[PDB]
Design a protein around this ligand. Structure first.
Ligand SMILES: O=C(N[C@H]1c2ccccc2C[C@H]1C(=O)O)c1ccc(NC(=O)C2CC2)cc1
Length: 167
């Protein structure tokens, strides 16, 4: 039993809710919140900008030190950093950004990072300002992630479309 509330169950291990991932993280304080990161960990907008703002920019400060030491992530890769006031840990995962021309096949590799964590609160990777089709992202999630994932979808209209079209 866990503390996630109001989710629709899609499969054995994937759950979905119309929710603001920031508000959801603040209430649940999950072990892992996933950030929709880029390779530079520049958290300017979308989910990343929102999560970083909620940390009062502490996420960005920590991220800048990470990059200065380690260099950029790979598209499809991830790193574990602090969850600050939102979660124990933040798993920064880089899905391909279609608005930069990155290969959508890398979306499966991106979701594979979730399998290193037993339970996660997450957005749909490569959705929103990353330019992928969220219906496709949900399909890849379901077909790739085997651990327990609680998906937060900010837009109610999109949430309803994702549920109604789910196979
Ligand atoms: O952009 C956002 N979500 C979309 C996005 C973008 C980029 C990558 C993946 C995704 C998934 C997509 C979604 O709706 O699930 C987003 C989510 C939450 C906030 N919360 C706040 O601003 C708090 C109220 C002050 C802001 C933006």
């Amino acid at each position: 039993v866990n503390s996630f509330s109001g989710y629709l169950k899609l499969t054995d291990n994937v759950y979905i809710k119309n929710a603001d991932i920031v508000e959801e993280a603040k209430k649940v304080k999950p072990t892992v919140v996933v950030n929709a990161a880029n390779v530079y960990l520049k958290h300017g907008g979308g989910v990343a900008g929102a999560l970083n703002k909620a940390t009062n920019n502490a996420m960005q400060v920590e991220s800048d030190d990470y990059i200065a030491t380690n260099g950029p992530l790979k598209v499809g890769g991830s790193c574990v950093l602090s969850g600050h006031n939102l979660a124990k840990h933040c798993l920064h995962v880089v899905g391909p950004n279609v608005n930069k021309g990155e290969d959508i096949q890398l979306l499966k590799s991106a979701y594979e990072n979730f399998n290193q964590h037993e339970v996660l609160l997450a957005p749909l990777l490569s959705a929103g300002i990353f330019g992928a089709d969220p219906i496709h992202s949900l399909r890849v999630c379901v077909d790739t992630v085997r651990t327990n994932v609680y998906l937060a979808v900010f837009d109610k209209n999109l949430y309803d479309k994702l549920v109604s079209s789910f196979l």
